[PDB]
Amino acid sequence: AGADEERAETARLSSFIGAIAIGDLVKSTLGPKGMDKILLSSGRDASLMVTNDGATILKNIGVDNPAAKVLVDMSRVQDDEVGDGTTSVTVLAAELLREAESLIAKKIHPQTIIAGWREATKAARQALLNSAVDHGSDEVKFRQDLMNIAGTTLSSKLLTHHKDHFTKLAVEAVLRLKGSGNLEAIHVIKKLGGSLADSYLDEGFLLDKKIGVNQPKRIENAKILIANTGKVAEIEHAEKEKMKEKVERILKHGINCFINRQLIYNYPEQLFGAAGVMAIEHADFVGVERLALVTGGEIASTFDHPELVKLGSCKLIEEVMIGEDKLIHFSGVALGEACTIVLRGATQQILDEAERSLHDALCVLAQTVKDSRTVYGGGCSEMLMAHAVTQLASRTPGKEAVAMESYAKALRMLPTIIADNAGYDSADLVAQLRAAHSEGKTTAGLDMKEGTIGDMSVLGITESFQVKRQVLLSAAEAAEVILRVDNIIKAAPR
Amino acid sequence: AGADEERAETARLSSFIGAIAIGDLVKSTLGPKGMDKILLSSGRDASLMVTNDGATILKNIGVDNPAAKVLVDMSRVQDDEVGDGTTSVTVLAAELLREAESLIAKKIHPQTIIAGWREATKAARQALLNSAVDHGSDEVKFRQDLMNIAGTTLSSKLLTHHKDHFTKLAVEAVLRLKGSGNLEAIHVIKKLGGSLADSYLDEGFLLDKKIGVNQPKRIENAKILIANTGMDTDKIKIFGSRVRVDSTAKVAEIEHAEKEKMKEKVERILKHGINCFINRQLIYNYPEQLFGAAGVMAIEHADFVGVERLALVTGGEIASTFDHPELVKLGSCKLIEEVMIGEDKLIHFSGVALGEACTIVLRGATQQILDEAERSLHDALCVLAQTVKDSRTVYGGGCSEMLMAHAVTQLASRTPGKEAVAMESYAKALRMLPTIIADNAGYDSADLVAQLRAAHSEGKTTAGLDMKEGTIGDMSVLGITESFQVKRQVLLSAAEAAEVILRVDNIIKAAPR
Amino acid sequence: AGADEERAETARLSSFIGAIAIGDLVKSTLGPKGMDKILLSSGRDASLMVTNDGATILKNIGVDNPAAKVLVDMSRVQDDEVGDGTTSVTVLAAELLREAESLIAKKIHPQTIIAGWREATKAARQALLNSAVDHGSDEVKFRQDLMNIAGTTLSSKLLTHHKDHFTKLAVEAVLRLKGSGNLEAIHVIKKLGGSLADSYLDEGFLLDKKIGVNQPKRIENAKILIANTGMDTDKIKIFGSRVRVDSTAKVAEIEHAEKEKMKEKVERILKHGINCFINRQLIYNYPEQLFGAAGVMAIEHADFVGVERLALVTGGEIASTFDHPELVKLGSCKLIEEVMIGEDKLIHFSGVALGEACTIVLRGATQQILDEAERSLHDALCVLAQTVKDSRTVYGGGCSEMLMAHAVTQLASRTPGKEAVAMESYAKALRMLPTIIADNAGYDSADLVAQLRAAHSEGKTTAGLDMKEGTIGDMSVLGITESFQVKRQVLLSAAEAAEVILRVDNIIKAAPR
Amino acid sequence: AGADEERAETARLSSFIGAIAIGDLVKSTLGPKGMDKILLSSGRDASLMVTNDGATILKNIGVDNPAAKVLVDM
Amino acid sequence: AGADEERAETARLSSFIGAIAIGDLVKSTLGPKGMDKILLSSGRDASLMVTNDGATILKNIGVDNPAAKVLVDM
């Protein structure tokens, strides 16, 4: 069908509506008492994705007629170099649209106004390296390593009652991660729960498959094999020969485990159990890719593949009881370049937040190593910057000022949101918060447990420095695309 | 009783909409180059009324269901003791409501947020206590009679191409109006004729009526007679019925009786020397022939409002039945004549010895734009009276508003907890006025706000918004000033009811029904 | 009888909806941080009446189909024996209905639950001589006359800027009022002029009518005349007609007859020395000329209600036909004059020998809030009259409510069978009042409930809810107290009204007494 | 401050339309080859009025809501 | 079959409308302070393309009934 005629004010309006609908949903996602969102779609989606991470669910789908899919896409690039903390970039971009009504009031030309975004970009950078912060994050760091940003990032997530402990664990993972490679080979999965620790850290790669109930429970001094490839009587006999080749080569090596990214033939299965060797059927390729760098890998060919052409690391491979369920552990990698992170939880399918909380979590502290720079958490950064930015609008010659001042007041909502969900009155909170920040103590912040304000450093909360520099540059520009575009050329069968 | 149900959120919203709708119409009105709004209504008024005075049009009309009429009514009290200058008070109150949307995000206690009105008590302090206003305004005064505050009121008005001169004329009117004798008897009308002056100053009161084609053109040492009761005769309270009589002989006396009414009017009118008669209603035909021969000019259906002012003017009289002439009536005697003005014919009453009452006649092109002068003039009469004895003023063109805004921002953060949140919101309220003044001048509002703040911050209270310039300049050179009371009264009204109830800042919302 | 078919749960629902709808609107009203109210109507109401006094607005209108008007009607009965302080009785009755939802799960006999209210009679009785209160209220009094409860009634009202001063004035009025008769002859009129004091106390009665432009301005040793029959003479309900006269000559006699009515009025008016004449209805024109020369001030179409109070004031008189002068009329003599009060002119009657009847005049800033003062005075007068006779009052600010709640909690588990479930629920009802009082204050209600209970439990009766502070404080310094009978009657009344709601099949409209 | 309202650009159009309508009717009137115009309207006029002079015809009638009559009077 | 009927002067309008529709999107783009636009579409398109070049975006698509594609082609 052909239709959907919109121009000037109406076209702008479609942009306006997309921003307002998203902001309300992302609005309670910022701060300690964030709300759990669960979202499902038919087909290949699967089942359980319950999303507390605003960036993850938005990126995955593009369900309806209004245009906003592209703005959403932009947040992930931010995510790769830093992302989260709490999802605030979309909210700030959305609130900018409200002033668009005032743009018609200005009744001249919208283009003159958008130059403010460039200026906003400068505003972003002049809100970065001036108006100091923590100056910590020395490296490794026994106490400031975490119990920090993750606690605040986790704050938006309900599981904080036992999860805040989990959060502390995540920086240990980054300490090993830092070095020779980059942000690579990190795999983490939730395993519901039933322990105070709520997580065990694996010295190596995590896997979840089983050949069958029969077979040896444990393997030691394990060699790992990964394979790319999966007179009538003599034909039957020939099958025995495949069995024979597999066993003869296997015993000399001492093979303790076999993993293959595809269907496995039944005959060899009987052999592995008697030998004392555990095999994996249809293991995910991605897990293997991570594993090859870790174990020194090998060359995956035909059955010539064992012995020297393949390298097998030998610390400990076992199936262990994790709180309740069984999960396979590949561990003790000599290289140390790549590692695996394991976490658990209370279990209300809100625990699944950890599946994507973690996606934000993974990038933030890995980043922390690289930055050697961080900022105070609990919204400490936001109030300080807000006090400084209000002055800044007049500081600029013009054009820059109008957009910069509106931007400045935007920061006010974040402190409000952090304590709003906290179970305390936002109004009392916002006023008291500013007095401590304006005073000159950067350590002062939102003490959510307290219900008032306190020393953020004592609590132990800091945010990656990159989250603040990139987010500010990214937010203004992500916001600019929807306001600057009046009339999006299309055709909408739907 | 009945209809229109609103509570909490929805009710707050109705207040919200009323403030935003009024702000846009008043928005074009403020500052040295404003815009004209022209209104036409049905069933109770004659035609197109155009007002550049926000106060004048608002008092007259309650157009629709949303609430705004009560806020509007209050501005009039402001006029009686100060008023006008430029209409800025309504704008400050409206912008207060915008912050309310950000309050729902907080979702708990607007009242806790509200810490600001006590903080805004500060506005009563900071806005109109720092900066030395004005002082002397001696008396009569040669040069300082005008070319200052009246001009600013008018500059915001479009007619300034020629009306700046008109404003200058108005203080001359106030000089005669100063002293002892009350603020009364000032009459002004506009004439459809173009001239450079665009206005004429009369020595007395102007009226537009004539006896008829016959009668003397001009009278001197005139005696003025005003009667409450009409000249018409016949019915009386009891008819006496319509009679028939015993022969043609007695019907004659009835006609004769009519002659007697004619007789009384001339016989004692002559002793007085009566030169002019003014009656507010229908006039009987018989006297009309008599007046022409006598040399007396009478006015048929004279407007009552003109009459009451006229009595103050000539010392007045007691108006009753035909006994009213001679001593019971007092008549001033300089010159009464009918004089053609530009094109139309008008009758001029002048030379009143008492001097308390005077009249101003405006002249113009014949455009709707011309009707603008009527709106500006009303504004001017009120402005000058207040300026002369208030002995206090503030720098105009938004100079006052930017300064206070800088000061109020400091107040936020300085106060510790609870107190800070509303005080900043109150503070941003000053920012929209700078925007309102720039937008109507055709200059980019965004660019203007940034450059404006830097000059005010520096400390020159004189510097403000110059619309002709498109940027910022020295307000004092322009001669743009606002009276102290206009600014002072509004801040208390905004922070009056606001204080004590929900005792603090971010008001109103609905209550019962 | 029988038309509206609603049964059991649906019938209950109509009662249920009426209580919740009224509770939210009245909720703002109860504490020192209350709010004013705006109302809109069509159908002979002509203007918006601002009323935060819950009793006044509820009585005036029966807005919709669900029943509540009879429940509403009853609160006035409370009003003559006290009525105010702050509204609250309606809220408590409403709060009981919401837990009825848990009673459908219970699914038994609504009436069995009702035994709680008979139990509540015990609560009513033991809430008496349990609270611990103030004594005193001697008579007249030195410094406890006010700055107390009237101020609290006012605090819930938006007017408490200028107004709290007005309240202070009201006790002076009550001091003259004491004796046997309780509330006769008390009148209040709003003034539109501006004064910081905002009120003037008249020693007599205030009207607002004038004879005409002429007549002496001031009268001394005044004699007062009141006539039932009008000065006008002619038609009656049997018509003279519009008569027939034979030759015009005889129409003259009718004119002469008019003169005779004038003659009677002047001849005996003079002997008395008549200084003022008050007539409730239309006045005939002929006497009007007479009164001016005589030196007598008369009032045309005086309102009858004003006259009746005035009669008690003067000493009374027998009103009949023109024979009415001298002894059949009793005139009080002090001072009768028309005095301009800063703006709109009024006539002031003063110096009453009786002293029982008095008039209070209010002045203000000039707004909707000013009309509010009329609303506030009505509440102020009633409280003080009650305070002297009761000789007992209780601590305000919800101090009374928390103390009783602590005591009632013990009672529920201790009592036998059906009594236990009933008594426990009644006890929790008291808890909501602390929450409502705190919420309008500007401070957190949740925090407030816990802190409140700890101080009351301890044994300090003085301690209560402090709304401006947001925490618990000492009520006695504040000056908020409630009349002792307000609490006695509410306790007994609340239980009886709630009890009948579940029982009755349908609700609809008013008829009892 | 309201009545029949149109704002800025729409408001401009009402004045804009009145001028274009008058210009075409009057253009044929001018010079050696100008032509006579006749008007007919309902109620309170009669029937055919012909006015060569542009001023005489405009003054006589205020045909519709859009503004132009004040311009015409001058 | 038959829905929209156009002749001579209105035909000019359909042609007129195409020029105004294109001009608003293009004008923002012109000069040192221009803007970027994103188009979704469906079928034989990998993902939304965002084009600053007026020429590139117009060549790639022929969205509707009014005639403008040929003007674009040149």
UniProtKB/Swiss-Prot annotation, chain A:
Modified positions (Phosphoserine) in chain numbering: S47
A molecular-function term among this protein's GO annotations: unfolded protein binding
Residues that, per the record, bind ATP: G31, G85, T86, T87, E463, K468
GO terms under cellular component: cell body; chaperonin-containing T-complex; microtubule; zona pellucida receptor complex
Top-level division of the source organism's lineage: Eukaryota
Transmembrane feature ranges: none
Enzyme Commission code(s) on record: 3.6.1.-
Any one Gene Ontology BP term: protein stabilization
Positions that bind ADP: G31, G85, T86, T87, S88, S155, S156, G378, E463, K468
Gene3D superfamilies the UniProt entry points to: GroEL, GroEL-like equatorial domain, TCP-1-like chaperonin intermediate domain
Catalytic activity: ATP + H2O = ADP + phosphate + H(+)
Cellular location(s): Cytoplasm
Listed Pfam families: Cpn60_TCP1
Residues the entry annotates as binding Mg(2+): D84
Residues modified to N6-acetyllysine: K141, K168
Keyword terms of this UniProt record: Acetylation, ATP-binding, Chaperone, Cytoplasm, Hydrolase, Isopeptide bond, Magnesium, Metal-binding, Nucleotide-binding, Phosphoprotein, Ubl conjugation
Main localization of the protein described in the UniProt heading: cytoplasm
Description of how the protein assembles with itself and partners: Component of the chaperonin-containing T-complex (TRiC), a hexadecamer composed of two identical back-to-back stacked rings enclosing a protein folding chamber. Each ring is made up of eight different subunits: TCP1/CCT1, CCT2, CCT3, CCT4, CCT5, CCT6A/CCT6, CCT7, CCT8. Interacts with PACRG. Interacts with FLCN. Interacts with DLEC1. Interacts with SVEP1.
Entry function: Component of the chaperonin-containing T-complex (TRiC), a molecular chaperone complex that assists the folding of actin, tubulin and other proteins upon ATP hydrolysis. The TRiC complex mediates the folding of WRAP53/TCAB1, thereby regulating telomere maintenance. As part of the TRiC complex may play a role in the assembly of BBSome, a complex involved in ciliogenesis regulating transports vesicles to the cilia.
Protein name: T-complex protein 1 subunit beta
